Amino acid sequence: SYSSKAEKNFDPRPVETLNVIIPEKLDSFINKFAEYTHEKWAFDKIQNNWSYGENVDEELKTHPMLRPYKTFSEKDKEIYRWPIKESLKAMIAWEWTIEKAREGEYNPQPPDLSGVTLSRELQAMAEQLAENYHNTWGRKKKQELEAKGGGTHPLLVPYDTLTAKEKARDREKAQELLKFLQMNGYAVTRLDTSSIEKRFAFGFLQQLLRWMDISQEFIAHLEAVVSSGRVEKSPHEQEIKFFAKILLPLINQYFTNHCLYFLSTPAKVLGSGGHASNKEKEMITSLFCKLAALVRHRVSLFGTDAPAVVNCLHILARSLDARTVMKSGPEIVKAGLRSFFESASEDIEKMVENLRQNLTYTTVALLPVLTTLFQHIAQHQFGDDVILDDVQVSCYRTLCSIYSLGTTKNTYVEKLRPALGECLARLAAAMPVAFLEPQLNEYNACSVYTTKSPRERAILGLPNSVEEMCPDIPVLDRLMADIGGLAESGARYTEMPHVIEITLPMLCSYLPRWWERGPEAPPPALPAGAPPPCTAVTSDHLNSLLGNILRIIVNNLGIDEATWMKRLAVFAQPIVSRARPELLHSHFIPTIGRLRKRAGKVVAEEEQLRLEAKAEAEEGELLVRDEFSVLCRDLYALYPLLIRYVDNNRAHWLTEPNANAEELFRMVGEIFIYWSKSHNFKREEQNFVVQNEINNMSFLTADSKSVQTSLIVATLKKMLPIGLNMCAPTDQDLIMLAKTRYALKDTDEEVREFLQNNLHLQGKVEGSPSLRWQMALYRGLPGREEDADDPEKIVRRVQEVSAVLYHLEQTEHP
Amino acid sequence: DSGSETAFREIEIGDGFLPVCSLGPGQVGHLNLGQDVSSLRFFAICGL
C-alpha cells in the first residue's frame, strides 16, 4: 500500500456526492447490481446451510424476509438499493469516469468471488473506495458517539493505519463490486514504481539528495550576505536549523548502522542478506560528491556543524561500492567524483607550493577524508578500476607534490608531517600502479601509458615517459640504500625527520602489498603471471627493510622526545612478517639485551635511592620515575615486532630446540623480573598508557596476533613454553620446591644452594606412568641431547623457570 | 571477535563431557583421540 491521502480528535470527512447530479445512463447496471447484492446474500444464506423463510422468526438466525422472486415483495427491493446508489455516486464523484466497453444484455448461477487477483492501478481505486466506506461508517458512528464527549470507538482510525483483519469487510465489499465490474467489463479511469524505488532506502536517499540542493541554496545566500551586506536575519533560518540539527545526525546514524547492506554485492553478500541496487550505489556516490563539493569552501561557515560535516564525510567515504560505480555508472556522478579528485589534487599542490583558507579546508577536513577513502579502497582491493586514467594522474601529481615537501623545513611542516605521512601511506596502499621501478611498468596494465595510445597520451598532456612523471622519487634502490646508510650512521629523528615520518611509510606500505604480485609469491593464474612482473620485490628486500628499521630504533632508543617511535612500530607492523629466522640472533637479541641492561641499571639506581628516607631520596625517586617512563615508551615501541615474530616462529622454536630462543627467554624473563620487583615501573606504565593513548594500539595488536598488556601477555607468556620445554618433567618436583623456596622470601643464590642440596628430590620415569610418556616425548625430540643432565644446567633452568612461574602467578593472583 | 581465546567459559561440570563429532552428506573426517602420542599431530605445538 504505497499510497497516502496526503491530507492535513479524528474526524473522518465523507465525500460530498448528493449535491452533484448522479448520471443515470448506466442504470441497467446500477439496479442490476443493487438487486444482485441481495441475490448474493441469498447465496450466502444457502451457504449457511439454513434455507430462506417467509414468516418472521428470530430462531432462524438468518434473513427472515428472504423470499423467492416469485413471492418476493418489492418493498425491500426498493430500499436495499440505497447503498449501491451511494457507492456508485461516490465512485463516480472522485473524477473517475466510467465507460461501458461492452454493449449487451431463484438462484444466482453466476458466482461472484473475491479470491482472484487484479491490476494494481484499479486495486488502488478499490482500496480508496473501501477507505471511503470506512470513513463514512466512522462519521455516522461518531455522530452518535460525540453526544457524550468522552471516549472513542476502537475502530475510529484512519484506513491506512488499521490492520487488514478489520479492513477485511470493506476490502471484500470493494473487491466484490470491482469483480462485478471486471467480469461485466466496465472501464473506469481517473505510479508504476518498481520495487527498487519502493524501498525505504531509495526514498530516504532521494529526500537527502533534494535537501542537499535545498541547503546549498541558503549557503549560497549566506556567502552572498557575508561577502556584502552582513545581516544576522536569514530568509531560510528554519532550513539552516533543520539541516544542522537533525538531518546530519540522521544520515550519520543511518549509514553507520547500514554500512554492511550498502557495501554488499550480489556476487558475495557481506551482510546477513540483500544488497543495494546499482542505482542506489550511484546515488550514494552522488551524495558523497555533492557533500564534498558542499564543504569545498565556506568551511568557516557553519563552524558548529563542521565536526558533523567531517564525520558525515568520513561515514560516506566508508560503505562506498565504487567498484560498480566506476563500472558503467552515470556520467554526472562519475564526472563529479573525478572533479572532486582533481580538486583535491590541485588543493594539495596549493599548500605544497604555499609551504615552499586552504589549510582549514585541507588540514581539518580534506586530508583526513582522502586518507579514509584511500584506506577504504586499499582495504577492499578496489584499486583495480576506481583509480585509473585521470584519477591516476591526480594521485600521481598528489604524490609528487607531497614528496616535494621534503625541502621545506619551517615550523608548520614539522607539525603537518604526521597527517601528510599517513595520507601518503594510505595512497601508496591504494595505488594500483607501481610508481617505483617504472622501467617495468610497461608490463602492468594499471599504467596510463599502457591503457592509452601514444597519440592519446600526447593529446592528454602525458609525456609518454613514466620516468619523467616521477623525478622526485627515484627507483627503490637508492631509497633502500639511503635508509640502510642512515641506519648504519645512526641518524636521529631531529637529523632527518622527513625520512622517518614520510619516506618510511613509502616502503612499509609498498613492499607487502606488492610482494604478492612479485615473482617470489605464487601466481594465482599462470597466464596472468606469464608476463614479467612489473614489481620485483621479494622477501629479501622487506627483510632488509625490517633490519634497517630495527637498527634505526636501536640507534634512537635513548633519545628524549622520541614520540613517533610507536607510530613507526605501527607502520612496521605489517612488514614484520615474512622475516628470516636469523634475525632473532641478529637484531632482536642485541636490542632486548641492551634494554635489559638499561632496565637493570635504572632498577639498581632506584634500589640505591629507596634504601634511604630523605627528601633527596624523593627527588631521586622522581628522577628514576622519569627514566622508568622513558623506558616504558621504548619498551612499548619495540615490543610488538617481537610479539609478531614470536607468534610466527613459535612452532619452529618448539619443534626444534633453539639456543637463541632460550637466551631470549632468559633475558625477557630478567626484564619481567625487574618490572615485578619495581612498583615504579607499574605505575609509570599506568600513567604512560593513559597519557599516550597506547591502550588502543595494544588492544589492536592483541586482537590481531588488561592495562598491563604489553608486559605480561606479550612476552614471557607466549614465550613461556619456549623456556618450559627445556626443563625436564622429571625436574618438575624441584620446580615447586624452588617455588616454595622462593615463597619464603629467599634470594637467588640461596635457593640455588638448596637446589644443589636437593638434587635427588627429582622424580624418575619408573615413579609414575603419568610422566612416562612425557619422558618418551622428551627423548623423542630431535635436537635434544643429554648435555642438560649436568647439575649446573639443571639448577640454571630450574631456578629461572621457578622464578618466572612464581612472579607470573603472583601477577595473575594478587 | 572480541579477542578472547576461550570459545566457552563458566561451564558447569555436571555429569561430564564426551568427545563428539557430526558429519554431513558426502563428508569424511579423522577423529584422533590420541591413544598414541606419537601419531598425535600439533600436540607439542600447543597443549603438551
From Swiss-Prot, chain B:
PTM comment: The N-terminus is blocked. Channel activity is modulated by phosphorylation.
Residue stretches in coiled coil: none
Localization, UniProt: Sarcoplasmic reticulum membrane
Tissues of expression: Detected in skeletal muscle (at protein level). Fast- or slow-twitch skeletal muscle.
Superkingdom, taxonomy of origin: Eukaryota
Function of the protein: Cytosolic calcium-activated calcium channel that mediates the release of Ca(2+) from the sarcoplasmic reticulum into the cytosol and thereby plays a key role in triggering muscle contraction following depolarization of T-tubules. Repeated very high-level exercise increases the open probability of the channel and leads to Ca(2+) leaking into the cytoplasm. Can also mediate the release of Ca(2+) from intracellular stores in neurons, and may thereby promote prolonged Ca(2+) signaling in the brain. Required for normal embryonic development of muscle fibers and skeletal muscle.
Note from the entry: Binding of [3H]ryanodine indicates that the heterozygous channel is activated by Ca(2+) concentrations 4-fold lower than normal. Single-cell analysis of cotransfected cells shows a significantly increased resting cytoplasmic Ca(2+) level and a significantly reduced luminal Ca(2+) level.
Domain notes: The calcium release channel activity resides in the C-terminal region while the remaining part of the protein constitutes the 'foot' structure spanning the junctional gap between the sarcoplasmic reticulum (SR) and the T-tubule. Pore opening is mediated via the cytoplasmic calcium-binding domains that mediate a small rotation of the channel-forming transmembrane regions that then leads to channel opening.
The protein's assembly and partners: Homotetramer. Can also form heterotetramers with RYR2. Identified in a complex composed of RYR1, PDE4D, PKA, FKBP1A and protein phosphatase 1 (PP1). Repeated very high-level exercise decreases interaction with PDE4D and protein phosphatase 1 (PP1). Interacts with CALM; CALM with bound calcium inhibits the RYR1 channel activity. Interacts with S100A1. Interacts with FKBP1A; this stabilizes the closed conformation of the channel. Interacts with CACNA1S; interaction with CACNA1S is important for activation of the RYR1 channel. Interacts with CACNB1.
Similarity annotation: Belongs to the ryanodine receptor (TC 1.A.3.1) family. RYR1 subfamily.
Protein name: Ryanodine receptor 1
